[PDB]
Amino acid sequence: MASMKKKGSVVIVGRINLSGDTAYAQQTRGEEGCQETSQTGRDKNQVEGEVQIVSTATQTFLATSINGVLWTVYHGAGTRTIASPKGPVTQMYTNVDKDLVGWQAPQGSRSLTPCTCGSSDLYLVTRHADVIPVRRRGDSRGSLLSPRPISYLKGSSGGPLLCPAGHAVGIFRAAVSTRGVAKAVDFIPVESLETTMR
Binding annotation for Zn(2+): 115, 117, 163, 167
Known catalytic residue at 38: no
**Smallest separation (angstroms) from Zn ion to the CB of 162:** 8
Q: Among Zn ion, ligand 9H7, none, what binds residue 117 when CB lies within 5 to 8 Å by partner kind?
A: Zn ion
Q: Are 62 and 51 within 8 A, CB to CB? A: yes
The answer to whether the Cα torsion of 32, 34, 40, 45 is positive or negative is positive
Known catalytic residue at 157: yes
Bridge partners for 64 per DSSP: 51, 71
Look at the chain and count its residues.
198
Q: Among Zn ion, ligand 9H7, none, what binds residue 163 when CB lies within 5 to 8 Å by partner kind?
A: Zn ion
**Smallest separation (angstroms) from ligand 9H7 to the CB of 21:** 27
Residue with smaller CB distance to ligand 9H7, 85 or 94: 94
| Integer angstrom CA distances of residue 115 from 84, 90, 94, 139, 170 | 28, 27, 22, 13, 9
Binding test (CB under 5 A) with Zn ion, winner from 80, 127, 167, 173 = 167
Binding site residues, ligand 9H7, CB under 6 A:
59, 61, 73-76, 96, 99, 150, 153-157, 173-177, 186
**Smallest separation (angstroms) from ligand 9H7 to the CB of 150:** 4
113 binds Zn ion (CB under 5 A): no
Known catalytic residue at 155: yes
Q: Are 131 and 144 within 8 A, CB to CB? A: no
DSSP state letter for 42: B
Biggest CA–CA distance in the chain, Å, is 55
